[PDB]
Nucleic acid binder design. Structure first.
Ligand SMILES: [Mg+2]
Ligand SMILES: [Mg+2]
Ligand SMILES: [Mg+2]
Ligand SMILES: [Mg+2]
Ligand SMILES: [Mg+2]
Ligand SMILES: [Mg+2]
Ligand SMILES: [Mg+2]
Ligand SMILES: [Mg+2]
Ligand SMILES: [Mg+2]
Ligand SMILES: [Mg+2]
Ligand SMILES: [Mg+2]
Ligand SMILES: [Mg+2]
Ligand SMILES: [Mg+2]
Ligand SMILES: [Mg+2]
Ligand SMILES: [Mg+2]
Ligand SMILES: [Mg+2]
Ligand SMILES: [Mg+2]
Ligand SMILES: [Mg+2]
Ligand SMILES: [Mg+2]
Ligand SMILES: [Mg+2]
Ligand SMILES: [Mg+2]
Ligand SMILES: [Mg+2]
Ligand SMILES: [Mg+2]
Ligand SMILES: [Mg+2]
Ligand SMILES: [Mg+2]
Ligand SMILES: [Mg+2]
Ligand SMILES: [Mg+2]
Ligand SMILES: [Mg+2]
Ligand SMILES: [Mg+2]
Ligand SMILES: [Mg+2]
Ligand SMILES: [Mg+2]
Ligand SMILES: [Mg+2]
Ligand SMILES: [Mg+2]
Ligand SMILES: [Mg+2]
Ligand SMILES: [Mg+2]
Ligand SMILES: [Mg+2]
Ligand SMILES: [Mg+2]
Ligand SMILES: [Mg+2]
Ligand SMILES: [Mg+2]
Ligand SMILES: [Mg+2]
Ligand SMILES: [Mg+2]
Ligand SMILES: [Mg+2]
Ligand SMILES: [Mg+2]
Ligand SMILES: [Mg+2]
Ligand SMILES: [Mg+2]
Ligand SMILES: [Mg+2]
Lengths: 200, 61, 87, 128
RNA sequence: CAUUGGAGAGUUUGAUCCUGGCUCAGGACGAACGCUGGCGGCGUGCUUAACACAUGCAAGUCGAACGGAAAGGCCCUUGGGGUGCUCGAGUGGCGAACGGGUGAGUAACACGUGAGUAACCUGCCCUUGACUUUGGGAUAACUUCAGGAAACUGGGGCUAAUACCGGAUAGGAGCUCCUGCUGCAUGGUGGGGGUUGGAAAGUUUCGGCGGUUGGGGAUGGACUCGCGGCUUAUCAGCUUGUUGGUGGGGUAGUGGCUUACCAAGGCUUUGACGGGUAGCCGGCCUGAGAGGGUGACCGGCCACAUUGGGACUGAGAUACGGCCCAGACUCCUACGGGAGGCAGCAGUGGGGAAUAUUGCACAAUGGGCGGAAGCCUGAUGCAGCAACGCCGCGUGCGGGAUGACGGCCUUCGGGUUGUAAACCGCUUUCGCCUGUGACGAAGCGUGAGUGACGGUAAUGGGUAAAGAAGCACCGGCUAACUACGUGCCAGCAGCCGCGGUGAUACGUAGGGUGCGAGCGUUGUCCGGAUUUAUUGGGCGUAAAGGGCUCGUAGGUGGUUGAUCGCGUCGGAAGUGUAAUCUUGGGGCUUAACCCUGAGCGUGCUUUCGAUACGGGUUGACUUGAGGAAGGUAGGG
RNA sequence: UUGUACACACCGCCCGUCAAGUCAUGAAAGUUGGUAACACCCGAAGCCGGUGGCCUAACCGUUGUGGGGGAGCCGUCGAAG
C-alpha cells in the first residue's frame, strides 16, 4: 500500500522530475528499460494518464485514494483541478515537505507515519491527515533532534516556503495561514488533463 | 454441454469432476463454456510461468 | 405443550371455556324462552321472559362472557320485539 | 403502555441514544411516536438534551419513563417540574471549550520563544 | 436575469458514404473461482432445499392474593416451630399475541400515498366522578383407593383465597316520551321525564400495594375508500349469494357477513375471466437527466410457523417454542397405546459455484412479572470465524557512479536492469517482547459493592531495515517490446483476428505498464445503445405506409361574447417517521464510519386566490364543412 | 458509353436437389408425468342449530323438587379421502 521501488525510473517514464535534482535524471529524455529511445505516438489517454501518474507519484498517493480525492474535488464547488491540487497539498506529509522540515515527500511520510509530529496538540501518524486552516503542526518534543530534522534546519534557507505556511524552523512549528490556492501550488502537472481523464 | 479445456496440458478423462465457467470459443460452433483449471479433478497447466492464475498453476519457489 | 406456563394455560383455558359455555347456553335458553313467548303472543309471559333475558344478558356482559355491545344489541332486539307485541 | 425511553444509535462501542416516545410493544430501534431529545454518554460530562415542553406534555399525558430517562429528567430538571420532588437537579455541566483562531493568532505572534526555543534546539543539536 | 451535467472505439468495401447489428473501454454486487496474502477500523456473511433435523438454550414471574412446608436458613433432644426470612410442587394474577425468524403463499385495498368511521374495539398507563355492600357453595395441592409399560386416568375423603357463584346498591346499557341547538343521508348533541336492569377484594414487614364502575386522554388495532406501481389476447366471455331490495339473525363494527323472500342483475376489448411470475415499500445500483434494474443488511406494512382445517382462552391470536382433527414424517412402547415439529440462537446432514461459533454477559439499552430487593431475556451488547465490502497504514528514509558484478539484448561499440545493488548514515508506524491502563456508569445497589467486551483500546520502553508483495497485462481499441522455442502443430482470443519459418498476438525469459493486499476470471445489472428515441429515432430505394375506402369507440378542433374554475398557475395549513441521500457543523489520531442542524422527501389532502390557455355550460359569426339553384366534363 | 450481385476481378460470382456427418427443432400410433379445478359419494375436529329419558355443589322451593347447566345424540356447514 506504498510505492517502495525506485523513483528515478518513474520520473524518467513520466518525463519530468518527480522530486529532487542533479541526479540520474541526466538520462531524462527517455523512459527506463531497453526500449526507451524510440519515438512515441502519445494518444490523448496516454497524455492524460501521464498527467495523473505524475501527480500520483509526486504526492505518493495510490489509485483508490487519488480517485476518492477526485470525487471530493468534483463535488466541491469551484474548479475541480484547483480543488484536487488543494486537497493533495493539504495532505500532512506534503505540508511538512512544503514547510521544509523534510528533504522529500518520502522522508516526510516516514517521519509522519513514525509519529514525530503533533497536530495542534494531538499526535498524528497518518500521512494522509488533511490539515485544515489555522492549524499548528509541531515536531514531537522527544524527536526535536532527529538527524533529518537537523539537516532540514541547516538547509531550509535555500528552500522556498509557500505563502500559505509560516515555519518556525528551529522551533519545528508550521502555522497554516490558509488552505492554498492554485497560484500557490507550484505548477508541475495538468490538473485539467487529470479531470478530463477521470471522465472517460 | 460442451466445454473447452484451455492450456497446453490435460489430465481430465471419463467421469472426472470439473468446474465449468462461462466463456465462448469463437472458432468452435456450440462451445459456450470453459473448464476452470486447478479446480476439482482438473489440474493446473504444468509449465506455466505467466498468467498462472488463469490456468490454476501454483507459484513455484 | 413444552412450557409449564403453557400447560397451566391449557388447564385454565379449559376451565374458562366450561364457564363461558355454560353462561352462553343459559343466555341462549333465556332468549329462546322470550322468543317462544312472543310467538305464542302472550303479553305477561313475554314481558316476564324479556325482563329475565335482558337481566341475564347484562349479567353475562358484566361477567365478561359476552361483550357489552353484544348484550346491548340482544337487549335492543328483545325490547323492540316486546314493544311490537304490546302494540 | 406508552414509554419514554432510549433508542440506541451509533457505532459499535460508541452509543448515542435518542430520548424517544413509543409504546412498550415496539422494538427498541424502531418507529417512534416522537423524538424528544438526545443523550451521548460516551462524551465527557455526557450530553443530555431534552425538549422540556414535549417531555412535560408526555409525562402529563401519562407516558412512563424508563429508569435511564428518569435519570436524564432528574438532571434536566423536568423530573422535578413534573412529580415535584427534592432532587439536586444538576443541569448538565458543559463539556469545556477549545478554540483555534485565538491560538493561531497567539502563536503567529508568539514568535519570540517560538524561534527562541528554536535556537535553543539549535544548541540541542549542538548537544545532540 | 446561465449551467454543474452528456467523450467513444473496432468491424460489411478494392475504396467511399450511409444504414445497421455485434464486440469493447466505465460503474456495481449479500457474489463464486484462480493465483496471492501483513495489520487495523467499520460493516456484512445459506441468494439454493418454506429440505429433513440429534443436542443445549431462546418465557417467565409474583409469598405484600392462597393453602401451605418438599429443599436451603434461624430457633429447639433426631424431629419440632410455619416459627422469620426463604421456598420446590399446587391454586390464583399478569405475561405468554411482544421481542426473534422466514418470504412459501398472495396481482390482492397486500403495499405506497392521502383521507373517512355519524359503522368500530382498545389490557397495562394518565386523568376525573362515583364506589368498594351482604351472603354462599366447591376444588387443585394434600390423603386414600383402583387402573396403566408409559403418557397418565378415574373414584373416596379433606382444604384456602384477590379462585367461583346468590343478593343489595350504582350511569352515559335496553325501551320510550318531551324539548334546545344542529350535520353529510343513515343522523349528532344538550336538558328533563317514564320504565327495565348491569359491579367490586382484599392484603402489608404499616412504609405499602390493590378492587369495581361512569366520562375523557394517550397507546395499539380494525374496516371502508380516491390515486399509484408486472407480464400475457396463440386467455373473450365471467358470475347465481352472483348484483340490488325488504325482514330477521349475527358481530367490537358497516356489509350477501348470514338467512328467508322478491327482483335480474353485476363485470368486460379503456382487457373482465384465465395463464405466467412476484411479498410491497423507505431504499440500493446505474444514468447528464429522463429512465432502466433491484427489494440483501437497516426501517415500515403484510403474509406464514410440518401440510390442510378448526375453534378455544383472552383487552388483543397466521396463537413460532398452545390446544383439537386429518395427512405425511420421526421417535418410545410391555403392542394396549403414547411423544414431536430450529423459516428462535448456535449446530448437523443434505443440496449447492457459494455463506460462520454447538462463544461470553445481562455491565449498557429495550422487554416481561414483582411494592421492592430481585428474577427472566440466543432481544441486545459483545467476542470467534471468512480479503466478502469499504476505509486507513506498513513492507523503509536520506546519501551513494566506480554507472560494479550477474542476467538480457547488441550493430560486439555498447545498451539495459540501475541509485537499483554494494557501501554509508538514519527512523521505529505495524508486527514481535515488556510496562501502564481506560471511557462506556450523572447507570444500578439500603449498603458493601457493581464492565461481558477486557490487560481491550490508548500509551511508555525494547528489537532489528528487519517479520512483511503479489496479480494482471504489453498487435489495435488500451497504458506498456524485444529475444529464444514452436512451425495452421502446440495454442491464443472480448471483437478484429494470431500460428503455414524473422510470431511485438502461442510458450518461456529479460524489460516494461496498470493496479497493489490485493489482482484477474466467470456470472448478473445499468451505461456506452438516440439499439423502443416523453426528454430523444424513423418508414421513396437501407427494416418500416395497411391493396383501397366506408365507418364505431377514441384522439383531435375555425373566429368570438358571457360564465364555471375540472385541467393549469400562485399562496397557506397538514402530511411525506427514522435511517439513507445532498449539505452545514461536531466526534472517532485521519478516513471509512458515527452524531447533529437544514434541505430533499419530486406527491397527496384541505383551503384561499388568478382566468391567459385546455375543457364544461351557454350565445353569437361564416371563412372550414355540407346543401339549394344554375352551369358542366368524362373508357365511372 | 451502357449494364452488373464481379473486385481472387467471367478461369469471376452463384442456385437447388442428391450423398455423408453434426446440431437444434416440428409431426407422429402412442407412452409417461405434472398442475389447477369441477360434479357427485362419504365425511373427522369444530362453531352454530336442535334435542338430552342420563348426569348435575351455588339459584328457587309447596325442602317430594324445579330452574339453569353438562355428558350423550341429531342436523347444517366442513378438511381429507
Ligand atoms: Mg339446553
Ligand atoms: Mg340487531
Ligand atoms: Mg456488402
Ligand atoms: Mg475489410
Ligand atoms: Mg414456589
Ligand atoms: Mg416481526
Ligand atoms: Mg424482506
Ligand atoms: Mg373474581
Ligand atoms: Mg389497484
Ligand atoms: Mg339486511
Ligand atoms: Mg414466491
Ligand atoms: Mg419493483
Ligand atoms: Mg426486514
Ligand atoms: Mg374471548
Ligand atoms: Mg405461543
Ligand atoms: Mg410472535
Ligand atoms: Mg421451534
Ligand atoms: Mg438456525
Ligand atoms: Mg455439496
Ligand atoms: Mg433493564
Ligand atoms: Mg430495580
Ligand atoms: Mg432462562
Ligand atoms: Mg500503446
Ligand atoms: Mg520465432
Ligand atoms: Mg437507452
Ligand atoms: Mg450491454
Ligand atoms: Mg434508427
Ligand atoms: Mg409520413
Ligand atoms: Mg425496404
Ligand atoms: Mg398505398
Ligand atoms: Mg389485409
Ligand atoms: Mg367521433
Ligand atoms: Mg378552440
Ligand atoms: Mg373567453
Ligand atoms: Mg442525517
Ligand atoms: Mg474531525
Ligand atoms: Mg425522511
Ligand atoms: Mg369551452
Ligand atoms: Mg346540379
Ligand atoms: Mg465483392
Ligand atoms: Mg413434439
Ligand atoms: Mg356431508
Ligand atoms: Mg351445542
Ligand atoms: Mg333441564
Ligand atoms: Mg356432528
Ligand atoms: Mg376436498
Amino acid at each position: 500500500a506504498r510505492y517502495t521501488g525506485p523513483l528515478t525510473k518513474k520520473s524518467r517514464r513520466l518525463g519530468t522530475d518527480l522530486v529532487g535534482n542533479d541526479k540520474s535524471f541526466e538520462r531524462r529524455p527517455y523512459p527506463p528499460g531497453v526500449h526507451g529511445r524510440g519515438r512515441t505516438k502519445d494518444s490523448e489517454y496516454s497524455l492524460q494518464l501521464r498527467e495523473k501518474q505524475k501527480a500520483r507519484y509526486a504526492y505518493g498517493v495510490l489509485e483508490k485514494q487519488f480517485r476518492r480525492y477526485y470525487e471530493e474535488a468534483d463535488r466541491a464547488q469551484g474548479k475541480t483541478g484547483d480543488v484536487l491540487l488543494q486537497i493533495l497539498e493539504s495532505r500532512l506529509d506534503n505540508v511538512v515537505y512544503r514547510a521544509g522540515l523534510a528533504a522529500t515527500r518520502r522522508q516526510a511520510r516516514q517521519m509522519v507515519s513514525h509519529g514525530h509530529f503533533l497536530v495542534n496538540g494531538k499526535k498524528v501518524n497518518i500521512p494522509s491527515y488533511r490539515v485544515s486552516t489555522h492549524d499548528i503542526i509541531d515536531v514531537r518534543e522527544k524527536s526535536k533532534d532527529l538527524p533529518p530534522i537537523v539537516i532540514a534546519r541547516e538547509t531550509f534557507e535555500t528552500r522556498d516556503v509557500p505563502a500559505w505556511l509560516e515555519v518556525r524552523p528551529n522551533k519545528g512549528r508550521i502555522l497554516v495561514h490558509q488552505l492554498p490556492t492554485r497560484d500557490q501550488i507550484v505548477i508541475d502537472v495538468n490538473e485539467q488533463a487529470i479531470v478530463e481523464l477521470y471522465s472517460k | 454441454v460442451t466445454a473447452y479445456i484451455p492450456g497446453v496440458g490435460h489430465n481430465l478423462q471419463e467421469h472426472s469432476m470439473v468446474l465449468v465457467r462461462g466463456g465462448r470459443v469463437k472458432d468452435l460452433p456450440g462451445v459456450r463454456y470453459k473448464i476452470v483449471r486447478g479446480s476439482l479433478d482438473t489440474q493446473g497447466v504444468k509449465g506455466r510461468k505467466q498468467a498462472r492464475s488463469r490456468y490454476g498453476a501454483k507459484k513455484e519457489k | 405443550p413444552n412450557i409449564k406456563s403453557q400447560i397451566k394455560r391449557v388447564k385454565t383455558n379449559e376451565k374458562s371455556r366450561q364457564r363461558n359455555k355454560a353462561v352462553k347456553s343459559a343466555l341462549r335458553t333465556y332468549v329462546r324462552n322470550f322468543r317462544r313467548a312472543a310467538e305464542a303472543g302472550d303479553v305477561e309471559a313475554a314481558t316476564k321472559a324479556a325482563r329475565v333475558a335482558n337481566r341475564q344478558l347484562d349479567k353475562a356482559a358484566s361477567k365478561g362472557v359476552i361483550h357489552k355491545n353484544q348484550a346491548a344489541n340482544r337487549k335492543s332486539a328483545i325490547s323492540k320485539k316486546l314493544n311490537s307485541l304490546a302494540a | 403502555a406508552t414509554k419514554i425511553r432510549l433508542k440506541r444509535l451509533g457505532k459499535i462501542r460508541t452509543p448515542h441514544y435518542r430520548v424517544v416516545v413509543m409504546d412498550s410493544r415496539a422494538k427498541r430501534d424502531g418507529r417512534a411516536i416522537e423524538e424528544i431529545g438526545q443523550y451521548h454518554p460516551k462524551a465527557d460530562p455526557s450530553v443530555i438534551v431534552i425538549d422540556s415542553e414535549r417531555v412535560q406534555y408526555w409525562l402529563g399525558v401519562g407516558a412512563q419513563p424508563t429508569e435511564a430517562v428518569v435519570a436524564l429528567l432528574k438532571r434536566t430538571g423536568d423530573w422535578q417540574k413534573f412529580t415535584g420532588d427534592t432532587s439536586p437537579s444538576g443541569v448538565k455541566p458543559q463539556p469545556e471549550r477549545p478554540n483555534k483562531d485565538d491560538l493561531f493568532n497567539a502563536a503567529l505572534a508568539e514568535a519570540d520563544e517560538a524561534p527562541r526555543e528554536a535556537i535553543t534546539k539549535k544548541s540541542e543539536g549542538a548537544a545532540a
